[PDB]
Design a protein around this ligand. Structure first.
Ligand SMILES: *[C@@H]1O[C@H](CO)[C@@H](O)[C@H](O)[C@H]1NC(C)=O
Lengths: 425, 406, 395, 409, 395
């Protein structure tokens, strides 16, 4: 096998020092072109704001020491060398969560006779991307993977986006590469944009490791089905049940029970929702806003049911039905709301007393009925005022949520799509 | 290049990285310790642990790594793997796990004068005690203690790092705006650095970086305080419900159910230390006790409402207090056949009169219940308002000091 | 053994473990790959990850590791550390968050002809496209893709050992059933060049979930709540407990939502079968509550304010009660005294009239309850059958 | 100087740790195992994994490491780090995680005759499939399977250690230092050598040593926190039959509230039971039973309320039902007299309607008594049977049914 | 330093770190072992594991590593990597699930006389019997057993640096208070032979739990629920809410049982104090509900079908109300018209009799409620004091 002789010549006879940059003079720059391939998006668990992803880092550089004349050997046009034997550019994910800066598997490099070296190690990365909870669960996130070369400064090695050719003209690969066949869509997230950028920081200096950067962005949109089915619709329906308290007659002693039970169910939903989101304080989540609004409205419904019951149970022995109340709640509002021989002497005296008592009881009863009508009018007014508020608030909140598409173009000031279909020029 | 190979071979022919670089026996190596905060990941209060992503800006001089650049095509500095040179064992001493050392071993920068510079990265989990008294309206004081695990003050001299154009020391955690993520739950108020000694031990010296961070309580505000306020409103409202509705107990006891549900919600978020009670738990317990007392007074009012002469005799003190005095203060202020037929009518009239007297006494009892219920309404409104306002101002007066004292 | 010590010393004296084991660099190493599934550790529906305990059996020939047994006391096989010889870098292409290659560098068996046998253990965490449409009566098909990472088909070729993975020593899952399993080899070419095939072997296991835990823990309580839903319509309105009962059923279902949320997968790809069933139960209970409120309002209607519409009387008092076969429902001062007695009699006139009208309202409410009870029992049965039997018949 | 230095430098010189110490062809290395249990850390039902802390004692002979004591000042025992020596690759096979090896690589005690004594401690997480039928009144039968992952039966011979000529066929537990788990008690602890007859003496899986831990749970936590509260709360459903059947009686309130509490208990137990779906646990069976009984009692309360609140106008009380239930089971004068007659007639009618109402109420009460007795019997019998099945779930008297030996020291 | 470079070069040239540091093989290495407790990370009651952050100080003499300071510029102390020299294999015998030996091979301090000082850090996860009987007012005694794994006392002897662990730089726990701590050395002999002692050093720490978190977060709500369940007996039966109150208290107690199971450890060795109190509260509420049902049944006792027994009247109407001092409880057509009036009067008579009997039943029920209210308040106080007073006094 001539490969053995060739490798011995390259590494042993030539005294290859893997700790030295491949430059003939110690002022030139080694160019490392890198690209990212997303094998699969594993998770974006929002509780601790971590993006787990399976990616394949593609590396390419030149090493003048790993050059040979293919004819002087057999026609060997390529070699596979372990990375522990050759100089490797240490490019690390800087914004990682768990303390894993490097690739998972240090695979062999591929070397051509002209010194071209390609390295394609796969990696599992757990990067930190903050979560914008503003429109949860109708939100889209903007997560980033930031790669830096911390072993050499910008004067020594230059990071660049890899380039590809279509019709004789090469263009940079300014996006994350996704294989349409192998890639399996995430259960919860849809990828909208996937740009790639080489960032320079002019306020730093070239003789430092914090001057260069290559960042890959993933603008992903949540798929709102689990939350719509299990969280939003049942809460919305149970909340709408609170308006039925106004249609429930005061004689049926269950207005307060109904309203309070609705509030308890909403408290259960609050408990469920609290566990799904991080503790950040940038904004209140959309679902949180809706829960606060609906719980406040249901508390108002409970208070107003209490007021109605207090009115319904007033009696002439404890309250006075003033003329103002009668005019307001029995004439005006119902119209506006379109509402729908001593022994015989003793006997005579006894029957007169009976008649007097019966008349007094009848007056008592009719004024009680007046109080009942006042309560019914208050119920009708409350329903007409609160049901539309509930419906409109719910509709507005959730159509605002449903109108939260990503901007359709990353880098607001940029007219480029960063789409793999339309490379620059 | 070839010249870099030659220079490296010359530098490390007899160089031993295990030996601390001292010109003469007794010399001390000056080590400058700086910290750059890249990301304040977490401040887990259950385990009292702060996770940070940092760079350590270390600098020292190694007299052995000196060369004349004129003889090596003007090579001014080298990037040498960190394991090939002596380095001070600078570690995080107050770590919560067993990870003392750095995570990423970036290769060192060595200059022709012998100046070595090293900026390794790490994900550190330090332990800072949490002051759980104003949680979640609390500010924390979490430190990171750095010193040489091996060498003492007789061997190395710790110092603060220098700024970009080294002229004066940097006595703070450095934060690079280009690479820095705001936590979103914590605001950094102060980030000083200081060297600490120990009077008992003259061989001890460390450089401590202090992070004074204030929490943003919006999440807790919403998810605990707002529902608690609504439940307190319901607890007050129970005293406006008429006893005839048969709904007082439903309202009050359902409010108690809601408060215990919120306690279950909050269980998995409050730190489990016993040095103090967080203010949020105090507010929950205050609301719980207020709701329990509302239940007790609702039971009393219901008992008063359903009294009658057949069971109770109304005492003089109750009548004087609740019917004469309180209402104005509370603004309430309230032929054989013919003989048989005559006897039957007389009996009917007597029965009606007896029923009238009985109903009058029952109405007196019910009026007493009404007055007591109004009094409880006012008392509970006052108590709830005063208590909630007091607790909230106490929470809102908790701010980190202007001077970090460090 | 001194013989074996000498043999191992001679084999590795001039052996370079970075060179492929080929006599000429234009040849390819042929590797026989086999997968032995030992245990199905877990399936993660939310993250789409299937964790398995396997052995990756690899066989190939290293021409440089031959020897003549007669020269070594008759030794015909030896065990060598896998780190001492060239190994193929087989990588789990669809790895989710595990190790890409073999990490347990166990010893390998070497014949005197150079034939090598290597069966390192591994824990494969593979990306598994999970379908939750029929959960928990769901069948999952997902694979393990294997290939040589850095070598193409002209340098290292891999061939499956058998037609399917070896499940001889497979521990039974207790949550899944191995319905079928197979392995296929694929040749993939690229627009570059048709002379550089890229080979891989995909092993797929078809799993059928055992739906007993989820049945008893989720579906049965939902069935009880559904059955209780329609029970409120047989409860008379006189007992002030219709809303109590229906709302308490709703609260029980809402509390049970905790159990469902903590038990069923939280994917958003599709709505699970039990998800649809539980949504149906929720809407069923809410509809029952709404109509119960309507009935309670009807029962308490007062004659003074509301007068019975003619169509209501025609339908609910005359027509429907006839066609309800199951039910048993039917289908000086003397002048003052005299004036007072007349007043009492006329007041009783009026009271009886009002009572009769209120009774008619109560009767209409009762008839509506009976109709609704029939309708809701029927809807419960029909909806449950429609949701479940459709998938259950296929099994 | 330490003569051990000269001795060890002689022994390890020209020593290859890759080479099995088989003296000649067809020589089989005898490796004897003795497992000592230090702590039964836990048995996680959710993961179906058993965590143990063990000291495994491995003994074998390496003829290359023998020396003549008279030549080394009577030194007959040296300690050599295990990383310098050949070792039989004895590993735990049935591990849930990928941890096959020991935790701490202790020095090997080497005797002058070549005898080698290795006692490495290990933390092992082994697969223990869970029999959930009687949870939490259950006992598990966990095994630790040890075999060589390198060498087959033609190269090594795995055996159980023999002390004073008697095979140690059991896990060794030191009576004094061993601490009870707190949730599990060890009833049997046999050890035996097993063979996979589907394989030949090759394949390295033909032979193995299996150590068994038959452990019984102590269900005190479940009894005090789940079982007893659940039973007490569920028994409350029989009280509904003594409440009045009208508004304010609160039959439905009580019954449905007990059902809601049972739902809460269902949520509480969902977090404890293992997720396997081969059997329904005993506790799950009991919860289903009580929930079904509460549903039936709610139905019966609804039926009783319907019967007791019947009216002559909505329903007709046929005498057949009465027998079945209340059995086996001047013009001014004219106007004044007309008014009096009408008053009497109205009073009569009202009283009659009332009377029919009380008849319906009595029928309801009879139904309450009968159904109360039925429900009390049903609930008592069901609860007693279900929770007596668990009490009789005893660990077998013998570690192996048909084996008479007890496998104890 | 060229002097120290030369010293280190000449100091490890012929140094074998596998050999014990003794001049003669019949001597023993005397190691001074000291434990420094830096932090008490956690106490795991369920698994009985205590996690501590410690420094394991070790001192011994290595004659092979001595030098004359005058030959190396006066160097008297150097730092060496601990992996370059012989180290004692100290093992944590009662390790639960951590590392058995030191894994952080920090540098050691070597003196020119051969004296070595090594203070590596460690996280000890030690198994210790947790006694949850007085939880949360429980005191724990958890130990750390250390010893040389492979050497007996005649080859390597360990002795404590002092009689107590070093807690000079201990971090205050916030959950546990360190009552006492000590270290003991033990000689263990075997039936083999009495000339070979086996040495171990055991450090033990007496820890007292700070019972504020558990008190506030568990016990106080239980007290509140006990008080309310006692209160149920003051609610009149006429207000149809006795069952509402009692069963809602039971529901709150069930939710709080959920909370407790979330918080308290899931041990099974013995019943904690909180466990007994929770069970007592449950039984209290159940008995309250049962007796409330009895009172409700007595109150709604029909005089038509039931007649008051003489003993009930004698006890609950005559004597019991008298001893309740603090209470305020009491201690032609004309013939038809005439016959109609007579019928009205006699029906009023009958109604009055029935009402009187019903009122007597209601009075008996109310007296029973008063008695039971007193009794249950007394039981609540007595049980609450009984469950905790013994432990509180013990402290
Ligand atoms: C061991 O060596 C001694 C000499 O020190 C010798 O006398 C003796 O025979 C030797 N033993 C054997 C078994 O050869």
């Amino acid at each position: 096998n001539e490969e053995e002789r060739l490798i011995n010549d390259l590494l042993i006879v030539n005294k290859y020092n893997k700790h030295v940059r491949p430059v003939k003079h110690n002022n030139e720059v080694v160019n490392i072109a890198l690209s990212l391939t997303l094998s699969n998006l594993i998770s974006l668990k929002e509780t601790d704001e971590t993006l787990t992803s399976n990616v394949w880092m593609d590396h390419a550089w030149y090493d003048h020491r790993l050059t040979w004349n293919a004819s002087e050997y057999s026609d060997i046009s390529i070699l596979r060398l372990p990375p522990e034997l050759v100089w490797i550019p240490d490019i690390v994910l800087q914004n990682n969560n768990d303390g894993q800066y490097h690739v998972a598997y240090f695979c062999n490099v591929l070397v051509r006779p002209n010194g071209y070296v390609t390295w394609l190690p796969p990696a599992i990365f757990r990067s930190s991307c903050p979560i914008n909870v503003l429109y949860f669960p109708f939100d889209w996130q903007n997560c980033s993977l930031k790669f830096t070369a911390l072993n050499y400064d910008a004067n020594e090695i230059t990071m660049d986006l890899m380039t590809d050719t279509i019709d004789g003209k090469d263009y940079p690969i300014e996006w994350i590469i996704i294989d349409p066949e192998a890639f399996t869509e995430n259960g919860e997230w849809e990828i909208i944009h996937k740009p790639a950028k080489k960032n320079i920081y002019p306020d730093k200096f070239p003789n430092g490791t914090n001057y260069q950067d290559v960042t890959f962005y993933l603008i992903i949109r949540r798929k709102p089905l689990f939350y719509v089915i299990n969280f939003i619709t049942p809460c919305v329906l149970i909340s709408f049940l609170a308006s039925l308290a106004f249609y429930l007659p005061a004689e049926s002693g269950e207005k307060m029970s109904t309203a309070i039970s609705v509030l308890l169910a909403q408290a259960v939903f609050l408990l469920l929702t609290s566990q799904r989101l991080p503790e950040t304080a940038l904004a209140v989540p959309l679902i949180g806003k809706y829960l606060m609004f609906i719980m406040s409205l249901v508390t108002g419904v409970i208070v107003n049911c209490g007021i109605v019951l207090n009115f319904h149970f007033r009696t002439p022995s404890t309250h006075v039905l003033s003329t103002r109340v009668k005019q307001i709640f029995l004439e005006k509002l119902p119209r506006i709301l379109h509402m729908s021989h001593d022994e015989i002497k003793s006997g005579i005296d006894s029957t007169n007393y009976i008649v007097k008592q019966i008349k007094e009881k009848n007056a008592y009863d009719e004024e009680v009925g007046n109080w009942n009508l006042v309560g019914q009018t208050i119920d009708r007014l409350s329903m007409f005022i609160i049901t539309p508020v509930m419906v409109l608030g719910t509709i507005f909140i959730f159509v605002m949520g449903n109108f939260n598409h990503p901007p359709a173009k990353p880098f607001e000031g940029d007219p480029f799509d960063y789409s793999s279909d339309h490379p620059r020029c | 290049s070839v010249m870099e190979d030659t220079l490296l071979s010359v530098l490390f022919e007899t160089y031993n990285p295990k030996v601390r670089p001292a010109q003469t026996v007794g010399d001390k190596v000056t080590v400058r310790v700086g910290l750059t905060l890249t990301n304040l990941l977490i401040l887990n209060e259950k385990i009292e642990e702060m996770t940070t992503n940092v760079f350590l800006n270390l600098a020292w001089t190694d007299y052995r790594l000196q060369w004349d650049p004129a003889a090596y095509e003007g090579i001014k500095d080298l990037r040498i793997p960190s394991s090939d040179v002596w380095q001070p064992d600078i570690v995080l001493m107050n770590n919560n796990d067993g990870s003392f050392e750095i995570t990423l071993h970036v290769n060192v920068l060595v200059q022709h004068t012998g100046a070595v510079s090293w900026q390794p990265s790490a994900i550190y989990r330090s332990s800072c005690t949490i002051k759980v008294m104003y949680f979640p309206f609390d500010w924390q004081n979490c430190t990171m203690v750095f010193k040489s695990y091996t060498y003492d003050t007789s061997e190395v001299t710790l110092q603060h790092a220098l700024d970009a154009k080294g002229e004066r020391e940097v006595k703070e955690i450095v934060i690079n705006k280009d690479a820095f993520t705001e936590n979103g739950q914590w605001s950094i108020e102060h980030k000083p650095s200081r060297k600490n000694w120990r009077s008992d031990d003259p061989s001890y010296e460390d450089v401590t970086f202090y992070l004074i961070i204030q929490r943003k309580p919006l999440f807790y505000i919403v998810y605990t305080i707002i529902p608690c306020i609504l439940i307190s409103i319901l607890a007050i409202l129970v005293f406006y419900l008429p006893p005839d509705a048969g709904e007082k107990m439903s309202l009050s006891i359902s409010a108690l159910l809601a408060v215990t549900v919120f306690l279950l919600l909050l269980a998995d978020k409050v730190p489990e230390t016993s040095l103090s009670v967080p203010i949020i738990i105090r507010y929950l317990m205050f609301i719980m006790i207020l709701v329990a007392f509302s239940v007790i007074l609702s039971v009393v009012v219901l008992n008063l409402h359903h009294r009658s002469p057949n069971t109770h005799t109304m005492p003089n003190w109750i009548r004087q207090i609740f019917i004469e005095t309180l209402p104005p203060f509370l603004w309430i202020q309230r032929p054989q056949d013919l003989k048989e037929a005559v006897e039957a009518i007389k009996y009917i009239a007597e029965q009606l009169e007896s029923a009238s007297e009985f109903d009058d006494l029952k109405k007196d009892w019910q009026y007493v219940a009404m007055v007591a219920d109004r009094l409880f309404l006012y008392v509970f409104f006052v108590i709830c308002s005063i208590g909630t306002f007091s607790i909230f101002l106490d929470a809102s007066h908790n701010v980190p000091p202007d001077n970090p004292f460090a | 053994s001194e013989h074996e010590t000498r043999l191992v010393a001679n084999l590795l004296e001039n052996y370079n473990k970075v060179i492929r084991p080929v006599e000429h660099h234009t040849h390819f190493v042929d590797i026989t790959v086999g997968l032995q599934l030992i245990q199905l550790i877990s399936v993660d529906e939310v993250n789409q990850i299937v964790e398995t305990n396997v052995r990756l059996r690899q066989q190939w020939i290293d021409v440089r590791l031959r020897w003549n047994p007669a020269d070594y006391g008759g030794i015909k096989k030896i065990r060598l550390p896998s780190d001492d010889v060239w190994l193929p870098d087989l990588v789990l292409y669809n790895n989710a968050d595990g190790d890409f290659a073999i990490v347990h560098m166990t010893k390998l068996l070497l014949d005197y002809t150079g034939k090598i046998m290597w069966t390192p253990p591994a824990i494969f965490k593979s990306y598994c496209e999970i379908i939750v449409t029929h959960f928990p009566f769901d069948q999952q098909n997902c694979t393990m893709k294997l290939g040589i990472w850095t070598y193409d088909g002209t340098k290292v070729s891999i061939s499956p050992e058998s037609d399917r993975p070896d499940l001889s020593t497979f521990m039974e899952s207790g949550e899944w059933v191995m319905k079928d399993y197979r392995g296929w080899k694929h040749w993939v070419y690229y627009t570059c060049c048709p002379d550089t095939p890229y080979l891989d072997i995909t092993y797929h296991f078809i799993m059928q979930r055992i739906p007993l835990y989820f049945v008893v823990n989720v579906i049965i309580p939902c069935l009880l709540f559904s059955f209780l839903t329609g029970l409120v319509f047989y409860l008379p309105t006189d007992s002030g407990e219709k809303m109590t009962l229906s709302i308490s059923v709703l609260l029980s279902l809402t509390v049970f939502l905790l159990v469902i949320v903590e038990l069923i997968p939280s994917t958003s790809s599709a709505v699970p079968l039990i998800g649809k069933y539980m949504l149906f139960t929720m809407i069923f209970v809410i509809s029952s509550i709404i109509i119960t409120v309507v009935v309670i309002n009807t029962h308490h209607r007062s004659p003074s304010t509301h007068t019975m519409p003619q169509w209501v009387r025609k339908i609910f008092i005359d027509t429907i009660p006839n066609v309800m076969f199951f039910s048993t429902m039917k289908r000086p001062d003397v002048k003052s005294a005299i004036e007072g007695v007349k007043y009492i009699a006329e007041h009783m006139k009026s009271d009886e009239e009002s009572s009769n009208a209120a009774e008619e309202w109560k009767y209409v409410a009762m008839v509506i309850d009976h109709i609704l009870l029939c309708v809701f029992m029927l809807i419960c049965i029909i909806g449950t059958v429609s949701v479940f039997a459709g998938r259950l018949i296929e099994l | 100087e330490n003569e051990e230095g000269r001795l060890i430098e002689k022994l390890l010189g020209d020593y290859d740790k890759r080479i099995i110490p088989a003296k000649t062809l067809d020589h089989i290395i005898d490796v004897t195992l003795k497992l000592t249990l230090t702590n039964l850390i836990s048995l996680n039902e959710k993961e179906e994994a058993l965590t143990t802390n063990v000291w495994i004692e491995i003994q074998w002979n390496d003829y290359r490491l023998s020396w003549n004591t008279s030549e080394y000042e009577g030194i007959d025992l040296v300690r050599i780090p295990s990383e310098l020596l050949w070792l039989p690759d004895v590993v735990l096979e049935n591990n849930v995680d990928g941890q096959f090896e020991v935790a701490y690589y202790a020095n090997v005690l080497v005797y002058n005759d070549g005898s080698m004594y290795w006692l490495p401690p290990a933390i092992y997480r082994s697969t223990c499939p869970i029999a959930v039928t009687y949870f939490p009144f259950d006992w598990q039968n966990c095994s630790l399977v040890f075999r060589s992952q390198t060498y087959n039966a033609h190269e090594v011979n795995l055996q159980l250690s023999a002390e004073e000529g008697e095979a140690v066929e059991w896990i060794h537990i030191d009576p004094e230092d061993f601490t009870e788990n707190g949730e599990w008690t060890i009833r049997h602890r046999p050890a035996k050598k097993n063979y996979n007859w589907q394989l030949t003496k090759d394949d390295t899986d033909f032979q193995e040593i299996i150590f068994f831990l038959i452990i019984q749970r102590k269900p005190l936590f479940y009894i005090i926190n789940i079982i007893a509260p659940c039973v007490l709360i569920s028994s409350l459903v029989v009280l509904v039959y003594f409440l009045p059947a009208q508004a304010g009686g609160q039959k439905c309130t009580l019954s449905i509230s007990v059902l809601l509490a049972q739902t809460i208990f269902l949520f509480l137990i969902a977090q404890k039971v293992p997720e396997t779906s081969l059997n329904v646990p005993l506790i799950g069976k009991y919860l289903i039973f009580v929930m079904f009984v509460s549903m039936l009692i709610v139905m019966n309360c609804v039926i009783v309320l319907n019967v007791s609140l019947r009216t002559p106008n909505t329903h007709s009380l046929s005498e057949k039902i009465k027998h079945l239930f209340l059995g086996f089971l001047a013009p001014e004068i004219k106007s004044c007299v007309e008014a009096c007659n009408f008053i009497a007639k109205s009073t009569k009618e009202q009283n009659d309607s009332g009377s029919e109402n009380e008849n319906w109420v009595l029928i309801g009460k009879v139904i309450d008594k009968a159904c109360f007795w039925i429900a009390l019997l049903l609930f008592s019998i069901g609860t007693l049977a279900i929770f007596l099945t668990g009490h009789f779930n005893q660990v077998p008297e013998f570690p192996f049914p048909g084996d008479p030996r007890k496998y104890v020291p």
